[PDB]
Amino acid sequence: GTENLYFQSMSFSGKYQLQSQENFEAFMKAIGLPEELIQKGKDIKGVSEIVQNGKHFKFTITAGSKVIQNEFTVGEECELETMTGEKVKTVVQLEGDNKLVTTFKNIKSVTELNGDIITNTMTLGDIVFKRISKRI
Amino acid sequence: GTENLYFQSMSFSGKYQLQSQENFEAFMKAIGLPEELIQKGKDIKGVSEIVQNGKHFKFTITAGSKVIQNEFTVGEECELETMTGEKVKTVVQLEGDNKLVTTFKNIKSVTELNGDIITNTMTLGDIVFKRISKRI
Ligand SMILES: CCCCCc1cc(O)c2c(c1)OC(C)(C)[C@@H]1CCC(C)=C[C@@H]21
């Protein structure tokens, strides 16, 4: 026999304007981002978009001077393009009704949606890369 | 708005008779179980029960000379009682259709159901506490 595990989450779909950003320079250096691109995009506060259809997600992230697009299904292994352009395979999971959690290359990524504010925290050792964006 | 995330797993419900057990003493020593209780329950091969109703689990596990009962919902943070009686808060996740995975106090716990055979693997550093039970 089989069991049905049905979940319900807040809609992550929407366009989000980057407002706050912590430890950008430190984090990009740890992952090996060139200093040229670090200073070029450290002050860029762009707009990211999420498209959620059930457990499927489409991410369009404006990070610094780069636009990185990725797609995944919750609970299924996916190939994600990192900030450094390297492609890693990982699984994204839903915690509660508003947290998207994944871990790749010693980076613990947590994306929590609180109302119109979405917070993406990425921890690499002592570095806590925290981004705060608002739905527009 | 809200989104629906539909998952399906094998039914974990049933009573399971412990058959094989490796590194009981080493694991219980690592978590600080008193040596009196370690020798007392190292050879006990009891029966554990799982009650799964969708994404909610009720499991009564016979570990050594202790009967520990806990309840949780997959993806939601819950409070679990450990072997040492300490209560920890963690999140249990479903991997595939037959794996229940969680991590607490540097202990990676994996419970995999392959047909009528259930395998409980708990890794704490170098110690791999492996329990193999059969549904009865
Ligand atoms: C259904 C899986 C969710 C996690 C359940 C989970 C939690 C837990 O309290 C225990 C579980 C596994 O299995 C045994 C082998 C009895 C453990 C022995 C040593 C420790 C620290 C605690 C025991």
Numbering used by the authors:
A (entry chain F), B (entry chain A): -8 to 127
What's the paper's own text on this?
The structure was solved by molecular replacement using the palmitic acid bound structure as a search model with eight copies of FABP1 present in the crystal asymmetric unit. Examination of the mFo − DFc electron density maps after initial structure refinement revealed the presence of density in the binding cavities of three FABP1 molecules that could be modeled as THC. The density was weakest for the cyclohexene ring possibly resulting from alternative conformations of this ring in the structure. Weaker density was observed but not modeled in the binding pockets of the other FABP1 copies, likely representing lower occupancy THC molecules resulting from the poor solubility of THC in aqueous solution. Examination of the THC binding site revealed that the conjugated rings of the cannabinoid occupy a hydrophobic pocket within the FABP1 cavity lined by the sidechains of Phe18, Met19, Ile22, Ile52, Met74, Phe95, Phe98, Met113, and Phe120. Additionally, the O1 atom of the pyran ring is well placed to form a hydrogen bond with Asn111. The hydrocarbon tail of THC extends out towards the pocket entrance close to the sidechains of Phe50, Ile91, Thr102 and Phe93. Importantly, the bulky THC molecule occupies the majority of the FABP1 binding cavity consistent with the binding of a single cannabinoid molecule observed in our fluorescence measurements. A comparison of our THC bound structure to FABP1 in complex with palmitic acid reveals that THC occupies a largely non-polar pocket some distance from the more polar environment of the fatty acid. For example, the ionic interaction formed between the negatively charged head group of the fatty acid and the sidechain of Arg122 is absent in our structure and is instead satisfied by a malonate ion originating from the crystallization solution.
Two members of the FABP family are found in hepatic cells; liver-type FABP (FABP1) and intestinal-type FABP (FABP2). FABP1 is unique among the FABP family because its large binding cavity confers the ability to bind two fatty acid ligands simultaneously. Furthermore, THC treatment induces hepatocyte accumulation of endocannabinoids in an FABP1-dependent manner, likely indicating competition for FABP1-mediated cellular uptake. Here, we demonstrate that FABP1 plays a major role in governing THC biotransformation and metabolism by facilitating its cytoplasmic transport to hepatic CYP450 enzymes. The hydrophobic nature of cannabinoids results in membrane sequestration and necessitates soluble carrier proteins for trafficking throughout the aqueous environments of the cytosol and extracellular fluids.
